[PDB]
């Protein structure tokens, strides 16, 4: 809970990957300093002009591997592309994002490792391989990128669509504040003795959005940059 104020803030892949992808001392998560972007996001029955910014990055659990002997072997495990399996089930309305949103990552100095279209579409499993020698038990984690969204005017129609959401009335209009997660072609294999307890999507949502963000004051552990609406370099 209050552990979220103890997580550091990182900017760009070098800082994020360097922090999270440590096999001797793995880290649960970190806040992300990123640029704000404006463009359409399809929620429910139409598109909405949405403000998107990276806010957090965490290690998602993949699998536990057991090698009982001093034998060199090849490991086959399943990673995912696009939105996380946890996010996909957390939304009940029709949800679609245009690949051009990836300007957010370019700007915030992040590269998913997947193609623009692969990165922001439906969850897709894929096989990855690693040469491993035992004896030992190992834990595989995959990097997840969390984004905070302000789907303008969506709050009246799609408040109940997301498991964790916040509405904010701006005149006759009702803004929708929610969180989304995508995967990165980045994984860390840690010996079980050094393994850290992974954070899950409900914890991340409860702490990042519900506990550390106030839509009314646009403040908390992070804030949106509404100047994206007037920057052509930050519009898609």
């Amino acid at each position: 809970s209050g552990r979220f104020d103890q997580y550091p803030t990182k900017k760009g892949d070098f800082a994020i990957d360097g922090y999270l992808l440590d096999y001797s001392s793995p880290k649960q998560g970190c806040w992300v300093d990123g640029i704000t972007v404006y463009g359409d996001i399809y929620i429910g029955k139409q598109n909405w002009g949405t403000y998107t910014r990276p806010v957090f990055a965490y290690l998602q659990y993949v699998e536990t591997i057991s090698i009982p002997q001093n034998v060199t072997t090849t490991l086959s495990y399943q990673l995912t592309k696009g939105h996380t399996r946890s996010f996909e089930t957390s939304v009940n309305a029709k949800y679609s994002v245009g690949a051009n949103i990836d300007i957010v990552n370019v700007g915030s100095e992040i590269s998913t490792g997947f193609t623009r279209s692969e990165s922001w579409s439906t969850t897709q499993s894929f096989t990855d391989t690693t040469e491993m020698k035992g004896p030992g038990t190992f834990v595989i984690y995959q990097v997840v990128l969390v984004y905070a969204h302000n789907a303008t005017s969506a709050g009246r129609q799609n408040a109940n669509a997301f498991a964790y959401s916040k509405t904010q009335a701006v005149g006759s209009r009702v803004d929708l504040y929610y969180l989304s997660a995508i995967t990165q072609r980045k994984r860390v294999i840690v010996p079980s003795s050094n393994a850290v307890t992974p954070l899950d999507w409900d914890t991340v949502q409860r702490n990042v959005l519900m506990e550390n963000y106030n839509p009314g004051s646009n403040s908390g552990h992070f804030s949106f940059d509404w100047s994206a609406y007037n920057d052509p370099h930050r519009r898609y």
């Binding site: 002009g49 403000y51 303008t152 701006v170 209009r173 803004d175 646009n218 509404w226 609406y229």
Partner: peptide
């Protein structure tokens, strides 16, 4: 926050 969005 500025916007162009409306319910249709």
């Amino acid at each position: 926050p500025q916007s162009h969005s409306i319910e249709l």
